[PDB]
Amino acid sequence: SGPGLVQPSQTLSLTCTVSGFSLSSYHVHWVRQPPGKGLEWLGVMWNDGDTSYNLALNSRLSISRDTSKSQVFFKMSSLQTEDTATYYCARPELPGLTYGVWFPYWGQGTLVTVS
């Protein structure tokens, strides 16, 4: 949740409520799907706390979480027209200890529209 219509430059915070498990035990990934069906990685957060992003949103989006309340957050700032898309969150079932990072989803979406 947290989605909706957008004017370009605006800000927005999406949430993601998890259940069935503890947030310290796995990771969570913000991935979007644009209207032309393309899928993009928005942000990740290693199990230690570090977080990467692609250049696409570097400096504008800020992923965060609350291991206590079981919440994942995405704080978009300076929204652009190209951020329009469905936003999902997922846990990864792949410790990057052994060089994978598989991504189990569990989100049903939440459409953000920047116009």
């Binding site: 799907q33 899928l39 990467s52 990057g96 990072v101 598989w102 189990p104 989803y105 049903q108 979406g109």
Partner: protein, 107 residues
Amino acid sequence: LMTQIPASMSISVGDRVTMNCKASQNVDSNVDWYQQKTGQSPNLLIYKASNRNTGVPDRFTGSGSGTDFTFTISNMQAEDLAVYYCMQSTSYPLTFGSGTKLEIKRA
């Protein structure tokens, strides 16, 4: 990053199909495959290049070496239509393939 070919894949029920992806560099075996049935979120099929996720029927199998990985469906059934996506998770940033839409050829 990733390249997925083909874009569209018309297949008849019972047929076999293959979708492949290529990586810009070596990512070993960390490539998974997702099915996004129409009107739903994507779902996992194979992870680790070749391992089937729980619940996935064995008509799906994965393989690949160096930079090319392939998903194979031996006997295409009706439920298998939708868009498939490969993704690697070798190292960051994680990246998805552009997608291959499988459509069922019918009378």
